[PDB]
Amino acid sequence: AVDPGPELDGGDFALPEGGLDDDRRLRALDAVDEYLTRKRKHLVGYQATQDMQGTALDLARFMPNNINNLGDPFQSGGYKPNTKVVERAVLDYYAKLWHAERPHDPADPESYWGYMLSMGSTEGNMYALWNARDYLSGKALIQPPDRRNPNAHHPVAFYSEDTHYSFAKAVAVLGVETFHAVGLEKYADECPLVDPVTGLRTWPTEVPSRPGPSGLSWDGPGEIDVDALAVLVEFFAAKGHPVFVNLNLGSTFKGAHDDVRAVCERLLPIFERHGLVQREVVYGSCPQTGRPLVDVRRGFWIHVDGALGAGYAPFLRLAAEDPEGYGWTPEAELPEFDFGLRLPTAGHGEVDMVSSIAMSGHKWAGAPWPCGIYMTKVKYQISPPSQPDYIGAPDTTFAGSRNGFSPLILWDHLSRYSYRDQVERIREAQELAAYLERRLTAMERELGVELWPARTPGAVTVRFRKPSAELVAKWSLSSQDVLMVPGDETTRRSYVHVFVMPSVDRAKLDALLAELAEDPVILG
Amino acid sequence: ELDGGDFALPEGGLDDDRRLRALDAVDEYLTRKRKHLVGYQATQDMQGTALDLARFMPNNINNLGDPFQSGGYKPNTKVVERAVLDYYAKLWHAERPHDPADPESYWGYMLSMGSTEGNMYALWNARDYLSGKALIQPPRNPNAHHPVAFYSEDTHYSFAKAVAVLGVETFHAVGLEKYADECPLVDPVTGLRTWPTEVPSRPGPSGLSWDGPGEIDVDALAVLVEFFAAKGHPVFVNLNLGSTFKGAHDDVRAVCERLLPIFERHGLVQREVVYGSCPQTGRPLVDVRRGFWIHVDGALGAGYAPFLRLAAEDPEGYGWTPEAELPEFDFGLRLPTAGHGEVDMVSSIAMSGHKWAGAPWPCGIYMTKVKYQISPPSQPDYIGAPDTTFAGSRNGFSPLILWDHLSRYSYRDQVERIREAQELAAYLERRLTAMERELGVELWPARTPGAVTVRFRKPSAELVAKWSLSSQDVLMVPGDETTRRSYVHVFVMPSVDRAKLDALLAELAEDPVILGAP
Ligand SMILES: *[C@H](NCCCSC)c1c(COP(=O)(O)O)cnc(C)c1O
Ligand SMILES: *[C@H](NCCCSC)c1c(COP(=O)(O)O)cnc(C)c1O
Structure with a gap:
């Protein structure tokens, strides 16, 4: 009988013809913040890192800009408030990480291109x-x-x-x-x-x-x-x-x-x-x-x-x-x-x-x-x-207007961590996923319940039996149904998984495991 | 201008001083360019929204799935998204609420x-x-x-x-x-x-x-x-x-x-x-x-x-x-x-x-x-909804941006915004034609009635770069390369006021390509 907390109420956000005054506006934004803050600190079921923080401090200053990286990353264009210099640095980093040939060069067929x-x-x-x-x-x-x-x-x-x-x-x-x-x-x-x-x-x-x-x-x-x-x-x-x-x-x-x-x-x-x-x-x-x-x-x-x-x-x-x-x-x-x-x-x-x-x-x-x-x-x-227009081939991307704030986000992230730091992030996640699997199998033995834990060697996710709706909602557990024999609906099992991203630490997993141990669906 | 060397990302990372100097360089560039941009149909002023919404940057918001269905990714702003969709639905005389049982009701995202x-x-x-x-x-x-x-x-x-x-x-x-x-x-x-x-x-x-x-x-x-x-x-x-x-x-x-x-x-x-x-x-x-x-x-x-x-x-x-x-x-x-x-x-x-x-x-x-x-x-799929959206993960911050904007302005304020732009576009067209008479040069000014943009002869590359003027070439007889003309345009968005246009016009009047005549 655990509480995921109240969801946002539509009436708080309805936009009238006359606008909202500053008090109603702030109340609604505070409600969004209180909701998002509670949910982000408990999210463990999706493959999305939840802690950035230094990023917000570094990059809030850019919110006033309508940044647009319209056109090819490697080409000048007319929309001068763009971050293509930053985009190129990020692409260059990943090019080196993925053993592509850099720099990008339109005259070298083997050099990378991306955006x-x-x-x-x-x-x-x-x-x-x-x-x-x-x-x-x-x-x-x-x-x-x-x-x-x-x-x-x-x-x-x-x-x-x-x-x-x-x-x-x-x-x-x-x-x-x-x-x-x-x-x-x-x-x-x-x-x-x-x-x-x-x-x-x-x-x-x-x-x-x-x-x-x-x-x-x-x-x-x-x-x-x-x-x-x-x-x-x-x-x-x-x-x-x-x-x-x-x-x-x-x-x-x-x-x-x-x-x-x-x-x-x-x-x-x-x-x-x-x-x-x-x-x-x-x-x-x-x-x-x-x-x-x-x-x-x-x-x-x-x-x-x-x-x-x-x-x-x-x-x-x-x-x-x-x-x-x-x-x-x-x-x-x-x-x-x-x-x-x-x-x-x-x-x-x-x-x-x-x-x-x-x-x-x-x-x-x-x-x-x-x-x-x-x-x-x-x-x-x-x-x-x-x-009949000329000037290179700037539109060789999927989007037209492109997000030039994203380059900043990822540049800021990559600038803060060394290769060694990045190795430690994947190390800690791998070790914590192994820990979670160990703890789930120990739970089955302690409580005498089936959790069906499974972890692919080398994966940063562990799957197990879906708990109550309220626990799933509290921790944003992603769900998947499987039929154990294809085309037979009587063999259905409901799984959740936890993704051990770098913002998921031992304390978080232990808090989830403790609620899991008393969950009414798990106990049966 | 932004130097690539300042942004290169080494294996070892960048220290705090280097990081800040780079972000300061970006901010100085962007700020100068955003304050002069008049050639693209992009509103450049929203500092109220920065003060309101910066607080949400710590969240990995994801509006995965259909805006009108719940899903598993709880850090989402679908309630806000719906409010924004509902506003535009009313504005565009669509039938609301969205209701999957009513074929005539809107759906959007x-x-x-x-x-x-x-x-x-x-x-x-x-x-x-x-x-x-x-x-x-x-x-x-x-x-x-x-x-x-x-x-x-x-x-x-x-x-x-x-x-x-x-x-x-x-x-x-x-x-x-x-x-x-x-x-x-x-x-x-x-x-x-x-x-x-x-x-x-x-x-x-x-x-x-x-x-x-x-x-x-x-x-x-x-x-x-x-x-x-x-x-x-x-x-x-x-x-x-x-x-x-x-x-x-x-x-x-x-x-x-x-x-x-x-x-x-x-x-x-x-x-x-x-x-x-x-x-x-x-x-x-x-x-x-x-x-x-x-x-x-x-x-x-x-x-x-x-x-x-x-x-x-x-x-x-x-x-x-x-x-x-x-x-x-x-x-x-x-x-x-x-x-x-x-x-x-x-x-x-x-x-x-x-x-x-x-x-x-x-x-x-x-x-x-x-x-x-x-x-x-x-x-038999995992959670977002029985969705029909183009994007998979979806930006859940944009709902907040637009919700924040729409909540600040009445219909009457919105009417005033489009009035001011229409009147300033007319003003720009008057000024350009006056400038042709004063200087004795051809600027080819043109403005489609009701449009918030005015086209004219392309000035110097320096001026184009300072004011982010969008450029277009036209062939005055299709297929004949010898009839090429180079236009720019100015878009009078709500962030473009008279002072901005007068500062542009004063530079145009002394521009060597404009003065350089036919
Ligand atoms: C946008 N055209 C000008 C470039 C953007 S300046 C803000 C545009 C599009 C494509 O939209 P985005 O994907 O938003 O660039 C489509 N149709 C028209 C009429 C446009 O002006
Ligand atoms: C992403 N799946 C989970 C999305 C929500 S948690 C961040 C995913 C995609 C689609 O990517 P987005 O468009 O980024 O959702 C494509 N391929 C794989 C393997 C994915 O996991």
């Missing part, structure tokens, strides 16, 4: 799939054949069943076809995978994730099944389709890390066998006698959805390579995932495997609103829509 | 980008709705599911991006592909029946659109829409309410009056829609929908036009009669049908919060009605 997002990673995943759709479908690139094969400009998208819902939305928005939709449409009877529940060759809706003790993915780690991916990708690559793969680096519910290096090692030979490392691409034509114009491109695009994990994984991997220097050996290996991942081929030399990465600033770093980064390389940049 | 997101969402929502994809509440023509998009040549570049992103085909692309020799318009320069790339805007003294007002040519739109409607296509029309360069207002009521008879003739008001087919032997489940969608891009103008129209309706009561008439554009626009019923003509509206109101970052509103909401992709 800070005005939404969260939803914007970065949309941009990634937009950029990949056009690149793989043969639209024109920024400056510096597909003969016969009718599938050459029909890209197929692959991602695991732990992929965030934003991807399904982005696929629908951009008209990108998933392997499931193309399989059902064109190849209805040819699914190369056997369903482990039914035994039938039915196209799964997403690439299977790895099984747990059950034999099915519901209690698995949440990592993509690399074997199954390879079977699916080979099938579609053999038919002549170009290939888009999204890999999750810190999945939404289980905090899993898809094994990016293993995926790439497994797929590269498939891409080489089916002519997808280098292929000539017809992009339109100009009318005379012979029609098409042609350039050379890769026929695959691997994107890393690092909304969460691109913020901490580089730091964990720093510790893994020098465990003595940082005083910490991480328990789990996190796979190589970034722009430095290169593999040798049979006959194209070393291939740099990853094409893009997104990250959310409001997840690991923390911010007062959604923000983040999309990064790729110059060689992937698409030519924007033409016009 | 606050954007995490600017109007780019709202225009993208509108075109996504219209593409799915017009192409027959499944709705939330629904309890032989081969072109029936091929919508065609129409908008003027003054349409913001965000639309061209949105069209590309969503795979929506414009009338130009469909014309070229399917109907290459059948363009119903003649080009005024060539005399050939060439498909124009966008719907013509109205001509100026030149006989061409470059010196026109920037409003869509209603005749031409009607001709083009008729053509594609006759062939069975459903129709999307974007109308600009405060165009980007000229600040023009497309005559939404005139458009609607002109198009409705076309929609009724070709069965687009009530069209049978094949949205799928059942598990039993292939027969369709069918819904009745309209086959047209009119969206108002009010990025700028949806924030002031309701207040100008208030004064127009009661000019004695507000002590002001606006010199130009702004068209009825909103969800209250209803026309009589052939059968003496009524039809509500507008489907959606976008507005930017960082334009007329002002904000520290991009934000805004998308609003439509319950009857147009699309069914999301099917999956």
Whole structure:
């Protein structure tokens, strides 16, 4: 019978024609503050860091400015109250962190390009799939054949069943076809995978994730099944389709890390066998006698959805390579995932495997609103829509007006912490997630109750049985239902999770655990 | 100017002195530029909101999911968001409250980008709705599911991006592909029946659109829409309410009056829609929908036009009669049908919060009605809501910014804001023409009646950079590179007062490009 506290009352905020006087205004803002303050100090169920504080002190002075980073980060524009100099410094930091080639240089196809997002990673995943759709479908690139094969400009998208819902939305928005939709449409009877529940060759809706003790993915780690991916990708690559793969680096519910290096090692030979490392691409034509114009491109695009994990994984991997220097050996290996991942081929030399990465600033770093980064390389940049106006190609971003306050937030954050400090943040979170799992299993033994605790090795989240609605509301626990046998509603379990972000300390977890021990749903 | 060296972020971090010196540099730059900005449609003054709202910066606010549903992320401002949406719903004569059971009630949400997101969402929502994809509440023509998009040549570049992103085909692309020799318009320069790339805007003294007002040519739109409607296509029309360069207002009521008879003739008001087919032997489940969608891009103008129209309706009561008439554009626009019923003509509206109101970052509103909401992709999912929003995580600070703003000003104060801007825009245009006579030079001043922007000849790069003047080149004869002209404009936003304009004009009068004459 615990109290989450009162929610905000709509009548306090109704905006009348005549305006509100200063007393009613302050009362309403105080109510918002008291609400937000209580909720932020108890939030443990979402992958969003809640303590910034130094940031507010450093950056409140900028609130009077209508800052607008309209246009490309690397180009001057007319709207002078912008922070593009700060944006570039942040992008440069992450470029180095993710082993991209810097500085950005439009003359160097291998150098990075990216920009800070005005939404969260939803914007970065949309941009990634937009950029990949056009690149793989043969639209024109920024400056510096597909003969016969009718599938050459029909890209197929692959991602695991732990992929965030934003991807399904982005696929629908951009008209990108998933392997499931193309399989059902064109190849209805040819699914190369056997369903482990039914035994039938039915196209799964997403690439299977790895099984747990059950034999099915519901209690698995949440990592993509690399074997199954390879079977699916080979099938579609053999038919002549170009290939888009999204890999999750810190999945939404289980905090899993898809094994990016293993995926790439497994797929590269498939891409080489089916002519997808280098292929000539017809992009339109100009009318005379012979029609098409042609350039050379890769026929695959691997994107890393690092909304969460691109913020901490580089730091964990720093510790893994020098465990003595940082005083910490991480328990789990996190796979190589970034722009430095290169593999040798049979006959194209070393291939740099990853094409893009997104990250959310409001997840690991923390911010007062959604923000983040999309990064790729110059060689992937698409030519924007033409016009009789001139002056570079400033609009090569998803947003038009762009948030120039977000650069400040993340610049301020990154300036305050060294690499060593960032390693300690991921260390403390990893150790606290392990602690939480230990305490939950001890609770089961102390009380004689089932909590179903689960933690993927290397994840900063632990899942367990959903407690009462009031406890869930007090601590902002994110919920997920799973069916333990797909398509059977009698096997439903309700889970919550806790994300151990850097603002979650031992005291917080202990306070949650103590209420959990007396919760009426948990006690049963 | 800001030196990159001062902002580089080393592996080791920056100490407190270095951090502060960098933030001081940013503040000194921004402050100087914000105080002189007059060339973009962005209100620069909101120091009241800084004092009110700085306190919330410690919170990672997230309005994940639908604004009208609870969710698990408790640090959210959805109650505030709804209050802001309700204000604009009333202002735009939408039906409130939002109610999923009332198809005519509004639905909208606050954007995490600017109007780019709202225009993208509108075109996504219209593409799915017009192409027959499944709705939330629904309890032989081969072109029936091929919508065609129409908008003027003054349409913001965000639309061209949105069209590309969503795979929506414009009338130009469909014309070229399917109907290459059948363009119903003649080009005024060539005399050939060439498909124009966008719907013509109205001509100026030149006989061409470059010196026109920037409003869509209603005749031409009607001709083009008729053509594609006759062939069975459903129709999307974007109308600009405060165009980007000229600040023009497309005559939404005139458009609607002109198009409705076309929609009724070709069965687009009530069209049978094949949205799928059942598990039993292939027969369709069918819904009745309209086959047209009119969206108002009010990025700028949806924030002031309701207040100008208030004064127009009661000019004695507000002590002001606006010199130009702004068209009825909103969800209250209803026309009589052939059968003496009524039809509500507008489907959606976008507005930017960082334009007329002002904000520290991009934000805004998308609003439509319950009857147009699309069914999301099917999956047993985690919490936000059965949502239908573009953004995933959503900015929950922007509701506070706009709520704070709206609570400070009555309708009468809002009317005064748009009055002062209209009168100052007229003043600027007078001063520029006086300056041409005083100095004996051509400034090409132009102002669309009713617009809060004035265009003129581009001055020196130094002056442009000091006052953040937005620039645009025009070809005075399309395709001929030798007829290029360089314009700037000034946007008279509420933060632009007479003193600011007089300081600008005094510098313009001594500017070497302006004095350097033809
Ligand atoms: C984010 N999921 C949880 C969002 C709320 S807690 C901050 C997420 C996204 C979408 O990112 P936003 O647009 O930033 O919500 C995309 N991919 C993954 C793996 C995510 O966790
Ligand atoms: C905004 N155009 C001018 C640049 C912004 S100065 C504040 C604009 C858009 C796109 O809106 P944002 O995404 O908010 O830039 C769309 N339509 C029109 C008519 C606009 O003026």
